[PDB]
Design an enzyme around this catalytic site. Structure first.
Site, PDB file in Angstrom:
ATOM      1  CE  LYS A  46      -2.574  -1.905   3.313  1.00  0.00           C
ATOM      2  NZ  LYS A  46      -3.538  -1.978   4.441  1.00  0.00           N
ATOM      3  CB  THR A  47       3.872   2.274   1.905  1.00  0.00           C
ATOM      4  OG1 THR A  47       3.208   2.072   3.158  1.00  0.00           O
ATOM      5  CG2 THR A  47       4.728   3.523   1.995  1.00  0.00           C
ATOM      6  CG  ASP A  90       0.450   2.395   7.330  1.00  0.00           C
ATOM      7  OD1 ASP A  90      -0.368   1.827   6.577  1.00  0.00           O
ATOM      8  OD2 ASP A  90       1.284   1.772   8.019  1.00  0.00           O
ATOM      9  CB  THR A 135      -6.088  -4.503   7.888  1.00  0.00           C
ATOM     10  OG1 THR A 135      -6.099  -5.872   7.469  1.00  0.00           O
ATOM     11  CG2 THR A 135      -6.842  -4.371   9.198  1.00  0.00           C
ATOM     12  NE  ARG A 194       5.783  -6.719   6.153  1.00  0.00           N
ATOM     13  CZ  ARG A 194       4.853  -6.130   6.891  1.00  0.00           C
ATOM     14  NH1 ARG A 194       4.080  -6.823   7.709  1.00  0.00           N
ATOM     15  NH2 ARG A 194       4.694  -4.814   6.805  1.00  0.00           N
TER      16      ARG A 194
HETATM   17  N1  LIG Z   1       4.196  -4.673  -5.903  1.00  0.00           N
HETATM   18  C1  LIG Z   1       5.438  -4.400  -5.437  1.00  0.00           C
HETATM   19  N2  LIG Z   1       6.480  -4.218  -6.274  1.00  0.00           N
HETATM   20  C2  LIG Z   1       7.714  -3.945  -5.814  1.00  0.00           C
HETATM   21  N3  LIG Z   1       8.020  -3.833  -4.510  1.00  0.00           N
HETATM   22  C3  LIG Z   1       7.071  -3.995  -3.561  1.00  0.00           C
HETATM   23  C4  LIG Z   1       5.697  -4.291  -3.987  1.00  0.00           C
HETATM   24  N4  LIG Z   1       4.959  -4.401  -2.872  1.00  0.00           N
HETATM   25  C5  LIG Z   1       5.788  -4.192  -1.822  1.00  0.00           C
HETATM   26  N5  LIG Z   1       7.046  -3.947  -2.227  1.00  0.00           N
HETATM   27  C6  LIG Z   1       8.190  -3.680  -1.321  1.00  0.00           C
HETATM   28  O1  LIG Z   1       7.712  -3.751   0.024  1.00  0.00           O
HETATM   29  C7  LIG Z   1       7.866  -2.508   0.717  1.00  0.00           C
HETATM   30  C8  LIG Z   1       6.514  -2.060   1.275  1.00  0.00           C
HETATM   31  O2  LIG Z   1       6.316  -2.719   2.522  1.00  0.00           O
HETATM   32  P1  LIG Z   1       5.094  -3.738   2.758  1.00  0.00           P
HETATM   33  O3  LIG Z   1       5.118  -4.198   4.194  1.00  0.00           O
HETATM   34  O4  LIG Z   1       5.140  -4.765   1.655  1.00  0.00           O
HETATM   35  O5  LIG Z   1       3.759  -2.866   2.554  1.00  0.00           O
HETATM   36  P2  LIG Z   1       2.601  -2.885   3.676  1.00  0.00           P
HETATM   37  O6  LIG Z   1       3.247  -2.267   4.891  1.00  0.00           O
HETATM   38  O7  LIG Z   1       1.494  -2.049   3.085  1.00  0.00           O
HETATM   39  O8  LIG Z   1       2.259  -4.351   3.819  1.00  0.00           O
HETATM   40  C9  LIG Z   1       8.459  -1.512  -0.264  1.00  0.00           C
HETATM   41  O9  LIG Z   1       9.710  -1.031   0.233  1.00  0.00           O
HETATM   42  C10 LIG Z   1       8.692  -2.269  -1.554  1.00  0.00           C
HETATM   43  O10 LIG Z   1      10.090  -2.300  -1.842  1.00  0.00           O
END
Ligand SMILES: Nc1ncnc2c1ncn2[C@@H]1O[C@H](COP(=O)(O)OP(=O)(O)O)[C@@H](O)[C@H]1O
Ligand SMILES: Nc1ncnc2c1ncn2[C@@H]1O[C@H](COP(=O)(O)OP(=O)(O)O)[C@@H](O)[C@H]1O
Lengths: 306, 309
Positions: A46-47, A90, A135, A194
């Protein structure tokens, strides 16, 4: 490192088309995009999607957090924002009740009261875009959800998308993972980026210790087996949960007080970080009287059926 | 006990005429009297005069103190809760008002609106009923010009002649149950320093002395000997003042001494000394404030029976 163009974003189909349409329409009419709300399980990107949208719109970003906001929200909104930029928050559902009521005027007519004898100055704000990430829609109040122009959902990744993300990570890190090995790593992930990155890092450490330069499918499978993952992606903890349920309770209905205590767990993370995947994989069912093994954990754990 | 009619007030001539004129005029035009400020030495009957004015106007009182209405929220509470139209708000020691508290007094006195003390908190501009404010302070130099400019009427309380203090003593004795004689009360008033509080204190002390001696009617001789036992001379000097003059004359030859050696020679401080001791000495021509120090003015030698310089 991190994608910038919406084309570089991995996966997330049936959403990039709609998002692209909205972004191009907003660019064509030369106005800031309406406020956006992103749902979905945590750590799906999402970020990263917020960063991609900000870079596509050609404006800045002001990423903050829900439980980090009183007048500090006004302090962030006043100077740190220009016209048409994004204020990605967030965990927007964790906003304070006091702080939530200040967002409604900010998002409605772009005027809000700033702190300071007197504390009521209706300071006007420039037009901006607010992006929220949470979420589940059940955690957000109706007045806040009603003020968001666009509401979208992030779905899980297919194994191929996780595999190509692992490929990008290995290329950036300096590793020569193979297609089959990366695809296996992605398949053993629970549809989360992740988790896929964490698994790839662990496999990289295992291969480096083993003394190899090219990771093949057999080596990746052996390292993942050493980690403690099965063909369904189950860790050791989930197998322990199913085993203790089946053995100590015969698989019969057990409430969420005896199961947590029998595992030295709590009614907290368990049933929210363990049971969702088990139910999704058809491994555990929420009977009104308790929980059952759905007759499939017996085959998975190699136990005689009831 | 306490006089109510302006005719019952003891002494204070050349002020009751103007005060009566103002009170009757304000009654005739049926409007609250303008804000009043009375100066004068402490304990001459300022609070009693405020009570007399309030009773003659037929209204209430809200007597308070200067260093008690800081944090002007309580000042607003006093002005709003416990006041009606035309009620006096006598404030004692008005010069000791806080700057923040004083700043809120000006709008209350000028146009009768004030900002009573949360997103808004202290924002409400309560409309305030017409009222009269009476202030009490010792010297006009202690009050600031903006506050002194807000008072419509400014008057001064002068000292009492011995006959007025004597008749006040007679009234006190009648209220208490004593049979003081006119000559004894006149002597007591003469040994007072022109103030009513000192006269009443002296009367109470003489009453205790007479009661111990076992008498029922206090005569002039008994009052004189009781006052001598107290330690008062013919000019009303206490023991402390005579000690001050004696130590000055003996240890410094009567020459100029600053207000640092004199206080230290007496184990006193530059505070109450020159504030509660030297005023009377200068008024009686017993001490002079030379630029280089202080001198005995040649009369303390005669009073204390010392050879002149
Ligand atoms: N679709 C994507 N393509 C490339 N990198 C991603 C992607 N989704 C997440 N990432 C990587 O994961 C990190 C974001 O953290 P994440 O924990 O996956 O998001 P959230 O906190 O929303 O679950 C970013 O630094 C990025 O490098
Ligand atoms: N002129 C007067 N007539 C009668 N009583 C008086 C007079 N002046 C003062 N008093 C008495 O003194 C009291 C007032 O206190 P006082 O110390 O004299 O005033 P202040 O505190 O202003 O010097 C009253 O109780 C009153 O009984």
């Amino acid at each position: 490192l991190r994608p910038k163009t919406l084309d570089e974003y991995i996966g997330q189909e049936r959403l990039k088309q709609k998002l692209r349409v909205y972004l191009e329409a907003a660019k064509a009419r030369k106005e800031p995009l309406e406020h956006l709300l992103l749902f979905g399980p945590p750590g799906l990107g999402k970020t990263t999607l917020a960063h991609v949208i900000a870079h596509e719109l050609g404006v800045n970003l002001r990423v903050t957090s829900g439980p980090a906001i009183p007048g500090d929200l006004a302090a962030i909104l006043a100077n740190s924002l220009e016209e048409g930029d994004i204020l990605f928050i967030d965990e927007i559902h964790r906003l304070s009740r006091q702080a939530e009521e200040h967002l409604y005027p900010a998002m409605e007519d772009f005027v809000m009261d700033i702190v300071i004898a007197a504390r009521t100055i209706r300071l006007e704000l420039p037009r901006f875009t607010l992006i929220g990430a949470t979420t589940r829609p059940g955690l957000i109040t109706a007045p806040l959800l009603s003020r968001f122009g666009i509401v979208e959902h992030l779905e899980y990744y297919t194994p191929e998308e996780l595999a190509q993300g692992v490929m990008r990570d290995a290329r950036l890190l300096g590793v020569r993972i193979t297609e089959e090995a990366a695809l296996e790593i992605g398949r053993r992930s629970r549809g989360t980026m992740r988790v896929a990155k964490r698994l790839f890092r662990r496999v990289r450490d295992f291969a480096q210790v083993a003394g190899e330069e090219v990771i093949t499918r057999e080596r990746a499978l052996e390292a993942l087996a050493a980690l403690g993952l099965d063909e369904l992606g189950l860790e050791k903890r989930d197998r322990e949960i199913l085993e203790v349920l089946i053995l100590r309770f015969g698989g019969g209905p057990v409430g969420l007080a005896t199961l947590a205590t029998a595992l030295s767990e709590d009614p907290g993370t368990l049933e929210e970080v363990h049971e969702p995947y088990l139910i999704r994989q058809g491994l555990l069912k929420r009977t009104p009287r308790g929980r059952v093994a759905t007759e499939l954990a017996y085959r998975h754990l190699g136990y005689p059926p009831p």
